[PDB]
Each structure stands twice: as structure tokens, then as C-alpha cells.
Design a protein around this ligand. Structure first.
Ligand SMILES: [Mg+2]
Ligand SMILES: [Mg+2]
Ligand SMILES: [Mn+2]
Ligand SMILES: [Mn+2]
Lengths: 176, 180
């Protein structure tokens, strides 16, 4: 797998192997973030495996990943949902198209991404890939927002940023 | 380093090497838990390092540890605060002396402990020890308590059990006063 390097204006300029790409000096690249809800409207929150290079063991929104060259964001979401969670989903919907962020994890590993945000509903049972996900919780979106608002440090920095953007929170609040 | 083994009634029967002790079938042993507040009354919350054998990478209260032979529970608090956090403290106050818990961690390691709970003030700057703590935050107690209420699964189970104990929570609240 790779990541897609982006210039200032967001234009793809080349690629890097994905593992090699995330370092203390990560360069800007393309990503996505997804928030998954089940048919009952519960939010899936996941805990990243301790083997992930960036933010291992961190609670976060359902699924993130890295679109490959010429892959649509919707297809990347679908792909990683299958890969990380063995789950089938409805067509992903746009909830925060212009999200972009840079952050450094506790060991000094940086994410630096153009990271459009989506939401979808699961249409099958999860089947967990424990190389990616070490724990998960189905919960009310309302409670998750309360926890994000009270102890943001207990969640990934991008999950906090996405959830605290007015429009994004508005749009996630509707999948319930 | 060892742990002090306890029987049925809470009576020590011997010691066991610490690493060897914590397994899928951990025996009952002595521990402690401490909640630390700075002068301003903020609570120190910490994130266990990824290398901890039990609940690695989990957010929790300030410091937990295991009294050793000849050591009082309070001196163990003092020692671990220095070892894990580099920090000096005021005399630890007993806020939940009867706390006991058993729990299995995400990879199946069991903790099975008599774990009196304390609170104290820090009196020096932190010098975090990265072999034990990977992250930390100074917070308002109320915020932490709201977080635990909302998403209890995001924290260590013992942190949540202690914080929702009415008596222990009242003492935690007393430590939020600003103290020069
Ligand atoms: Mg991912
Ligand atoms: Mg400890
Ligand atoms: Mn990335
Ligand atoms: Mn123990």
C-alpha cells in the first residue's frame, strides 16, 4: 500500500510506501476518516491496535485510511471497512469535505493529512481484524460527543477536531 | 520487584515476583491507587505506556503500584510517584481504603487486588518516566468525572470504579481547592 503525496494546492505529486510514510517528519498526504453507525443509529467507536505506527491503542472514530492512486474516497472507505472491520456499508456520505490536520502522537509519530470525512451505515455484522483494531464499542453518538467535549485527550486528536466542527457535528447528528 | 500475596480474608501469606504474578490467573495481592492534584487543584491523569503488561496505552488516574516487603502503603505511593512521574507529594490521604477489584485486560492479563486508594498534592515539577507513562494531562476534576460518565469504556476500569465511589469522589473534590 501507499500514500499519495500532495502539494500545497492539494495536487497529487507522487507516492510513498505507507509504513515508510509515517515518521516524525510526515509529509502532507491524502487520507479519509469515516464514522459508522448501525441500523439502530449507534456509533461504532474503535480502539487502534497496539501495533499501529501512529496513535496505537487510541480510541477514535470508526475507520480511517489512505486512498490509493485513482481510488475514490468512497471506495477507500468501503475497502478499509472491509479490511479493518469485515463490514459491509451503505454508500458513504460527505460530512466534512475540507478537513485537514497535522498532529504528533505520544511517540513522536506525525500524521499530516488532507482528510475528507464521511459517514455510513453498516449492513452486516462486524468481523474484527485484530491487526488494526484491539477493541471497539457501540454507543450513542450523544454520549461520545459528551466525552469528547469533556475529556478530548482520551480520544484521537482528529476525532476531536472532526466532532467539534459545527457542520460535521450537525451532520453526524442525523445518522442516529 | 514483587507483590504481596493475600488470602481469602485480606491477610498476607507471602510474596511473588511481580511480572510472573500478573497472568491469566493472577492471585490476590496488595496494591495501591493514587489521585494527584497540583497546587491549583487540577487532577493529573496519565496514560499507561505501551510496554506495561496490563492495560497498556490506557488512560487512567495518576499512579498505581505495588507495595513491597517492609513498605507501608503510603511509602509505596511516594516511591511510585517518584519512579513513574518524578514527582514529590504531600502525605497521601486515604480516600477509599476498602477498594478491591478483579478485572481482565484487553489481552487477557488479570489484575486481582486489594487496592486502597489515596489522594495527594504534588509539590514539585513532573519528570515523566517514559517506560511507565506515555502521556498525561492536567485537568479539571469535573471534566474528568463527566468524561467517565459519558464514555466509561475509554478509561481504565479501576479509575472508573474509584471515581464513582461517593466517598472517594468527595475527597477527590476536596483536592480541587487552590492551595498555595
Ligand atoms: Mg485505518
Ligand atoms: Mg504503576
Ligand atoms: Mn497518514
Ligand atoms: Mn497487581
Amino acid at each position: 500500500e501507499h500514500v499519495i503525496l500532495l502539494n500545497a494546492q492539494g495536487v497529487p505529486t507522487g507516492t510513498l510506501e505507507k509504513y515508510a510514510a509515517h515518521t516524525a517528519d510526515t509529509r502532507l498526504h491524502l487520507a479519509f476518516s469515516s464514522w459508522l453507525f448501525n441500523a439502530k443509529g449507534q456509533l461504532l467507536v474503535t480502539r487502534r491496535a497496539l501495533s499501529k505506527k501512529a496513535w496505537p491503542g487510541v480510541w477514535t472514530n470508526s475507520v480511517c485510511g489512505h486512498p490509493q492512486l485513482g481510488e475514490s474516497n468512497e471506495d477507500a472507505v468501503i475497502r478499509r471497512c472491509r479490511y479493518e472491520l469485515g463490514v459491509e456499508i451503505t454508500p458513504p456520505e460527505s460530512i466534512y469535505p475540507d478537513f485537514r490536520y497535522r498532529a504528533t502522537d505520544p511517540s513522536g509519530i506525525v500524521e499530516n493529512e488532507v482528510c475528507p470525512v464521511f459517514a455510513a451505515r453498516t449492513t452486516s455484522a462486524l468481523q474484527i481484524n485484530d491487526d488494526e483494531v484491539m477493541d471497539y464499542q457501540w454507543c450513542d453518538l450523544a454520549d461520545v460527543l459528551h466525552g469528547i467535549d469533556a475529556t478530548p485527550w482520551a480520544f484521537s486528536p482528529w476525532m476531536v477536531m472532526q466532532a467539534t466542527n459545527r457542520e460535521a457535528r450537525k451532520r453526524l447528528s442525523a445518522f442516529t
